């Protein structure tokens, strides 16, 4: 049930984003742990430094490296994932 | 009404965060704009690169530069502000 709202990344990395987040929602209930899982997977796979926010109510303003930004919904939870540093 | 929950940052810079966020909450109604305002002010004053999340429900896992992290509440909104890159 993935709705990508904003993305500056390749399609493959987008798809990896969605699937990594889906796995994290299957495994964890707390937003922070879901975010931790995603962030850690991405630092491992794609190199640091990634940052992830998971929640139903937030606004953000962030800065990211070219081609390394995604903001999408999975059901009712919004997920922001991006690389910086 | 600032409740600092988690901080790795000088006291002065902490107090600047809170004041900056208070001014932002007076001025803007939308979380994203509040975050935008705070992030932008911090890039100007303390050099890039800062990132800011403002909301009533989210979890996060992020990485920051030593002494450049704060997470606090201001009324019913939580604010995450940190520097990386």
């Amino acid at each position: 049930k993935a709705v990508i709202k904003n993305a500056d990344m390749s399609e493959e990395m987008q798809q990896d984003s969605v699937e990594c987040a889906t796995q994290a929602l299957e495994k964890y209930n707390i937003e922070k742990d879901i975010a931790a899982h995603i962030k850690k997977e991405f630092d491992k796979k794609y190199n640091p430094t990634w940052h992830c926010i998971v929640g139903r109510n937030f606004g953000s303003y962030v800065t990211h490296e070219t081609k390394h930004f995604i903001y999408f919904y999975l059901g009712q939870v919004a997920i922001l994932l991006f690389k910086s540093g | 009404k600032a409740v600092i929950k988690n901080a790795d940052m000088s006291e002065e810079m902490q107090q600047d965060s809170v004041e900056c966020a208070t001014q932002a909450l007076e001025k803007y109604n939308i979380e994203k704009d509040i975050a935008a305002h705070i992030k932008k002010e911090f890039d100007k004053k303390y050099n890039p690169t800062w990132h800011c999340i403002v909301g009533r429900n989210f979890g996060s896992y992020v990485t920051h530069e030593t002494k450049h992290f704060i997470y606090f509440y201001l009324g019913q909104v939580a604010i995450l502000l940190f520097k990386s890159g």
Binding site: G59, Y61, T63, H64, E65, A78 | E31, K32, T49
Partner: peptide, 11 residues
């Protein structure tokens, strides 16, 4: 590396 700022808002 190019750096770009972005804002997001849940509805």
């Amino acid at each position: 590396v190019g750096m770009h700022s972005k804002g997001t808002q849940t509805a």
